[PDB]
Amino acid sequence: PQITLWKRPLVTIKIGGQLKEALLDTGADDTVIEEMSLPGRWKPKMIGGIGGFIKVRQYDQIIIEICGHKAIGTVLVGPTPFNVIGRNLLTQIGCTLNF
């Protein structure tokens, strides 16, 4: 599809059997989701942006459904103010910036 940027590009995603609203974010290297339960092992990580850093849990090979597109990748879980779909997953659904 073609999403204009007049407003926040929010989309519904399916992850860990749950449905959530997430921001299609080209500025994010990683995909960060609010506290939730995920299968598999994990390791600590610190990520930083505007406002500083937060500690999150890195889970790998996590499947996510985005607007009908199934993508697999690393997902960081932690106290993020907003759920963001990063480049590691945007590439998998073939998302690009155009102008």
Ligand X SMILES: Cc1c(O)cccc1C(=O)N[C@@H](Cc1ccccc1)[C@H](O)C(=O)N1CSC(C)(C)[C@H]1C(=O)NC(C)(C)C
The residues assigned a catalytic role are 25
Shortest distance, CB of residue 13 to a copy of itself, whole angstroms?
14
DSSP single-letter state for residue 87:
H
Residue 95: which of a copy of itself, ligand X, none does it interact with, CB under 5 to 8 A by kind?
a copy of itself
Q: Which residues bind a copy of itself (CB under 8 A)?
A: 1-9, 23-29, 32, 47-54, 67, 69, 80-82, 84, 87, 90-91, 93-99
Closest to ligand X by CB, 37 vs 53, is: 53
Q: Which residues bind ligand X (CB under 6 A)?
A: 23, 25, 27-30, 32, 47-50, 80-82, 84, 86
SS (H, E, C) 20-78: EEEEECCCCCCCEECCCCCCCCEEEEEEEECCEEEEEEEEEEEEEEECCEEEEEEEEEC
Shortest distance, CB of residue 10 to ligand X, whole angstroms?
10
- How many CB atoms lie under 10 A from the CB of residue 24? 21
Question: HSE (CB half, 13 Å, CA atoms) of 46?
Answer: 2
Shortest distance, CB of residue 12 to a copy of itself, whole angstroms?
15
